[PDB]
Paper text:
Gyrase is a type II topoisomerase and the only enzyme that can catalyse the introduction of negative supercoils into DNA;3,5 it is composed of two subunits, GyrA and GyrB, which form an A2B2 complex in the active enzyme. Gyrase is an essential enzyme in bacteria and has been extensively studied as a target for antibacterial agents;6 gyrase has been described as an effective drug target for the development of new anti-TB agents. Other compounds, such as the aminocoumarins (e.g. novobiocin), inhibit gyrase through targeting the ATPase domains of gyrase and topo IV, located in the N-terminal domain of GyrB (and ParE), thus preventing supercoiling. In addition, we present crystal structures of the GyrB N-terminal ATPase sub-domain from Mycobacterium thermoresistibile bound to one of these compounds (Redx03863) and also to novobiocin, demonstrating that this novel compound class inhibits via a binding pocket and resistance mechanism different from that of novobiocin.
Numbering used by the authors:
A (entry chain B): 18 to 102, 123 to 213, 246 to 255
B (entry chain A): 16 to 102, 123 to 213, 246 to 255
The structure:
């Protein structure tokens, strides 16, 4: 049933991200970034870092509270409930791979998803830091393009910074070295 | 299999036999081993660039554009990359790390592997690419080392020396803890 839900996304992605061209591809970034910016609005995060990797993956890191990793009532870690059932599960469904690294509850935690199928959540080292890193690889079977446009992403992140005064958003493109930092005082 | 585990446990039992000591000098030996493997690939004529990143979580990432660690099934019934990470020089880094991740571009694909206290995960085949190279990210074990705090200046001075001794190689160093950076490239 959880698998059927994610397969429904792959069958009709337009129902979830509007379309499967360049605008649909960029929706994967908007979803993950919106989740990070939500932590800034909530008063926990101060910075969101976005990287476009040369392998076509995108990495989004925040210093918010960290996606909860404790066991959920449904019998999987809460992070796995999130990545299989809520908004960002669409990103998992339409990615060949998603990795999550969370700083929370005194530890670094590692999870991966292989075509949306969770690995086993691993507890890493001790840390007082909190936050979330998500890295995802858009599925080229789904999208008409896997080419992210730096200028499109930069203009969106600059507007997000303008609506969320005091938030810093950094964007790095590892394909060609482009780098921008956006922030408005607040 | 018993022998492979015995070998890694021998390293944890007496790390001084393999990296000299378990203070700061010993800690920095983990970076030298991984970087040495990348620089050797470059100067054997297969790579042009080595990128070293000290992450805010205390992990170190070393990336090269060399041939990539071989990933094909080995005669022993595990992938060659798992033989490498459990048996050769870099297996000392794996043994003295709580975690090691390898991302290899080779044989037409991006490949993902992890090691939890040197125990391999299942090697995963990712997307298609002609590109080749190796990325290793490792988390030094604080139960082994007296300190896990790498020194930017120590790393920079050693990488500068490596670039000087290997003319034509680019070595880039970034430290996400405090934003420090260097790029070394001696023409040759
Ligand atoms: C993709 O996850 C997103 C988050 O994205 C990021 N990047 O943080 C963020 O947008 C937002 O994050 C929330 C949203 C609400 C709470 C929240 O209400 C918390 N309060 C708790 O006491 C708490 C503790 C454990 C727990 O399982 C839950 C409910 C489960 C949630 C929020 C998934 C809540 C908390 O600690 O963290 C929260 C966090 C991190 O919602 C998620 C989890 C869907
Ligand atoms: C940590 O792995 C290291 C490498 O480190 C990096 N960063 O590349 C590098 O130091 C050196 O890399 C070698 C060393 C030797 C060969 C080598 O002899 C190759 N030639 C082959 O035809 C070959 C192909 C498959 C195979 O399993 C073996 C052995 C060899 C090859 O393609 O790649 C090689 C590579 C990448 O040795 C490793 C793998 C232990
Ligand atoms: Na949507
Ligand atoms: Na959403
Ligand atoms: Na935080
Ligand atoms: Na990883
Ligand atoms: Na290469």
């Amino acid at each position: 049933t959880i698998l059927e839900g994610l397969e429904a996304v792959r069958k009709r992605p337009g129902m979830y991200i509007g379309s499967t061209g360049e605008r649909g591809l960029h929706h994967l970034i908007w979803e993950v970034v919106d989740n990070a910016v939500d932590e800034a609005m909530a008063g926990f995060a101060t910075r969101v870092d976005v990287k476009i990797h040369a392998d076509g993956s995108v990495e989004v890191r925040d210093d918010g509270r960290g996606i909860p990793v404790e066991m959920h009532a449904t019998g999987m870690p809460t992070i796995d409930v999130v990545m299989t059932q809520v908004g960002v599960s669409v990103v998992n469904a339409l990615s060949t791979r998603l990795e999550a690294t969370v700083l929370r509850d005194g530890y670094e935690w590692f999870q991966y998803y292989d075509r949306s199928v969770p690995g086993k959540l691993k507890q890493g080292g001790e840390t007082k830091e909190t936050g979330t890193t998500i890295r995802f690889w858009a599925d080229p079977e789904i999208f008409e393009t896997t080419d992210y446009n730096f200028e499109t992403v930069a203009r969106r992140l600059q507007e997000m910074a303008f609506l969320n005064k005091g938030l810093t958003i950094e964007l790095t493109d590892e394909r060609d070295g482009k780098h921008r930092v956006f922030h408005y005082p607040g």
